[PDB]
Amino acid sequence: KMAFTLADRVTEEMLADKAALVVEVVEENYHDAPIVGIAVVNEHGRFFLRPETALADPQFVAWLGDETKKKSMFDSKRAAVALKWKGIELCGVSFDLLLAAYLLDPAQGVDDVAAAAKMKQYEAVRPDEAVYGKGAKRAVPDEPVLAEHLVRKAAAIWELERPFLDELRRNEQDRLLVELEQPLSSILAEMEFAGVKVDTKRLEQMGKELAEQLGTVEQRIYELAGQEFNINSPKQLGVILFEKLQLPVLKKTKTGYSTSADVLEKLAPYHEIVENILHYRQLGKLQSTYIEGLLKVVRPATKKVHTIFNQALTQTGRLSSTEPNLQNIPIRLEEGRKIRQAFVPSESDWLIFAADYSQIELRVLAHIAEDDNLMEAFRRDLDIHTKTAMDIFQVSEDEVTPNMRRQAKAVNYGIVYGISDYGLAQNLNISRKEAAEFIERYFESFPGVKRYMENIVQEAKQKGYVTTLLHRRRYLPDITSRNFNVRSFAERMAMNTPIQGSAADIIKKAMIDLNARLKEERLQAHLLLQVHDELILEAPKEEMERLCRLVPEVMEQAVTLRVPLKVDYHYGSTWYDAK
DNA sequence: CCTGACTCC
DNA sequence: ATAGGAGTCAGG
Ligand SMILES: Nc1ccn([C@H]2CC[C@@H](COP(=O)(O)OP(=O)(O)OP(=O)(O)O)O2)c(=O)n1
Ligand SMILES: Nc1ccn([C@H]2CC[C@@H](COP(=O)(O)OP(=O)(O)OP(=O)(O)O)O2)c(=O)n1
Ligand SMILES: [Mn+2]
């Protein structure tokens, strides 16, 4: 039902100046993964190529790297990175159907061509899972079946490009795609392929010592409990705490007794076993995830880890980071923070440079809500996190520890994003009336924010979606539900998404501007990581002075708001030291 | 495969 | 019922 050539060699007609291109990588983690097949669809016909054929043909390789030869793809970053691992540069990607579908509606969870195609009632392609199978049954099918699938995917991209661009234009999102997300994709591809170097000697020594410490805490816990049990089974743990030791039950979940850190912290006055358990579970997570799990994904020959930044996943426009997640490396406790000493520059005499947007979503909220007082606070370069700390812990500015500020930061974001009096009371261990009064006072200090939150909820109910500064969208079809719980959750999404998503838009634009300023000054400095509102680079030590000016300035100027943007920055020999 | 832990923004 | 957005882990 669809004609195509199963080609034995590369012909000139396959190398047109516009094409849909499929470079198929079936492994979920595309780093150093097999390319199983190629398809090309263009004005001259539909072609399947074996990867041995195409990728060793010098003309096809040249065409791939020719920016003036334009390609329409789905998940071009997967292709771009897989090719880099095969020693080949991919340029000229002018349309990415994955990113287009993502901007139109992030809730569709589009993660294959078929699922994008569904959005325009296009049915002439199968889901990837139907062709490859799942789990231990997953396999590349016979060549004629594989070839048809890949050609059908390229034909779908070829046919769907205009319908998608048209819809993006109608939503005023086409610039978001072509000027922001697509260029960002190429930058993320570079960062992923570069990787981050790990000091495995230091990481292994930390793990050996951690295992000893864990053994000691484990035995103390068994002593306090009067018996051995699996501390990592909330179930067995629940029996020890709430049945054997008869501690109060402060919370249940659908499977039994809660032992969350929130709960255990509240039980600390009753038995010393609870603080030990909290510490054990922290140390246990460092072991399982940031030592052992990390070492499992280190590429042994180069000592590098290569994350994947998922650019079409979150509902607000943030990125996420997988295998490993390098956006949740410990920082808040010194014990955990030492893991960062194992993240080092990739060359001798280079350093790590880290830059973080100050009070980012508060600044964004001040702009969007046009709250006079909040705007005024940022024009005076106040620190709203430190101020809230002073207020809660009734201490002076000088007496506010970095830890009280972290706690106050949670209070600030919690309040603006709809925390209840119950929730704040449980967090601060104050009565509910006092919590309610604290929130009352807070919105009296920031009345524009209060009005803005009331109004964005109403707007969402009327339109069925909310939007960000650069026209990102999130639909909220639950926002008129008769069910209180369902409706309330959607209401809080309406409060949060525009602010978090607008901050995501800002850092994304900052990465594009920054990458261009680095390349034009021919600096060796390059991006390693994005951590939501932070950028991490490495550079020769001689470039530090330049970066100290360039990076904060580019980040601060990415967008112009009604309040200043401000960036904190540091550098050092390891990620730990870049503080 | 899901739940509930710990980790971050 | 009770700020929002994420990923990985061991045990269920
Ligand atoms: N065709 C368009 C138009 C806009 N945008 C995004 C990127 C910029 C942002 C703001 O667009 P503006 O050109 O500034 O439009 P405005 O009317 O000046 O601002 P707005 O429409 O958001 O009030 O929206 C887009 O992606 N595609
Ligand atoms: N508990 C938290 C922490 C963070 N965030 C969101 C809002 C801010 C954004 C970036 O996180 P941080 O850098 O920790 O917050 P910040 O306000 O930029 O604080 P800082 O001035 O320390 O950079 O993530 C959140 O919703 N809830
Ligand atoms: Mn910040």
Query: What number does the ligand 2 atom closest to the CA of A358 have?
Result: 21
Give me the DSSP letters along A9-50. S--GGGG-SEEEEEEE--SSS-TT----EEEEEETTEEEEE-
A174 CB under 6 A from ligand 1? yes
As given in the structure block, the two tokens for residue A126 are: 């199968």
Per CA to C1' distance, which residue is closest to C10?
Answer: A232
Q: Is A75 helix (H, G, I), strand (E, B) or coil?
A: coil
Other CB atoms within a 10 A radius of the CB of residue A143 amount to 13
Distance, CA of A40 to CA of A60 (rounded, Å): 11
Distance between the alpha carbon (CA) of A37 and the C1' atom of B6, Å: 41
Q: Is the CB of A532 under 7 A from strand B?
A: yes
**Nominal resolution (angstroms):** 1.6
Distance, CA of A116 to CA of A156 (rounded, Å): 9
As given in the structure block, the two tokens for residue A291 are: 């030592």
A485 alpha carbon, distance to own chain's centre? 27
Distance, CA of A26 to CA of A4 (rounded, Å): 22
List own/partner pairs for A210-219 with CB under 8 A and 24 or more apart: A210/A283, A210/A286, A210/A287, A210/A291, A211/A287, A213/A283, A214/A280, A214/A283, A214/A284, A214/A287, A217/A276, A217/A279, A217/A280, A217/A283, A218/A280
Window 261-300 of chain A: CB closer than 7 A to strand C? 288-289, 292-293, 296
* Contact yes or no for A508/A180 (Cβ under 8 A): yes
Considering the four listed CATH numbers 3.30.70.260, 3.30.420.10, 2.60.40.10, 3.40.50.300, the one that applies to the domain covering A1-193 is: 3.30.420.10
Give chain C positions with protein CB within 7 A: 1-12
Q: Is the CB of A271 under 7 A from strand B?
A: no
Distance between the alpha carbon (CA) of A414 and the C1' atom of C5, Å: 13
Q: Is the CB of A505 under 7 A from strand B?
A: no
Q: How many A from CA of A470 to the centre of ligand 1? A: 6
Distance, CA of A440 to CA of A434 (rounded, Å): 10
Topology adopted by domain A360-503: DNA polymerase; domain 1 (1.10.150)
- Alpha carbon nearest to ligand 2 atom 17, residue: A359
Longest dimension (CA), chain A: 79
Q: Is the CB of A42 under 7 A from strand C?
A: no
Beta strands in A177-219 (DSSP E): 196-198
Distance between the alpha carbon (CA) of A89 and the C1' atom of C3, Å: 44
A307 CB under 6 A from ligand 2? no
- Alpha carbon nearest to ligand 2 atom 7, residue: A361
Beta strands in A237-317 (DSSP E): 304-305, 308-310
**Residues bordering ligand 3, an ion, CB closer than 5 Å:** A 356-357, 360, 533
CA proximity to A577, closest of A551, A544, A554: A544
Query: What number does the ligand 1 atom closest to the CA of A174 have?
Result: 27
Domain boundaries, chain A: 1-193, 194-308, 309-359+504-578, 360-503
What's phi and psi for A249, nearest 5 deg? Answer: -95, 110
Topology adopted by domain A309-359+504-578: Alpha-Beta Plaits (3.30.70)
Distance, CA of A394 to CA of A397 (rounded, Å): 10
**Which of A104, A172, A182, A502 is the best mutation target for the ligand 1 pocket, counting ligand atoms within 8 Å of the beta carbon and taking the most?**
A172
Q: Which nucleotide in the DNA or RNA is closest to residue A282, CA to C1'? A: B6
Considering the four listed CATH numbers 3.40.1190.20, 3.90.550.10, 1.20.1060.10, 1.10.10.60, the one that applies to the domain covering A194-308 is: 1.20.1060.10
Query: What number does the ligand 1 atom closest to the CA of A169 have?
Result: 1
A470 CB under 6 A from ligand 1? yes
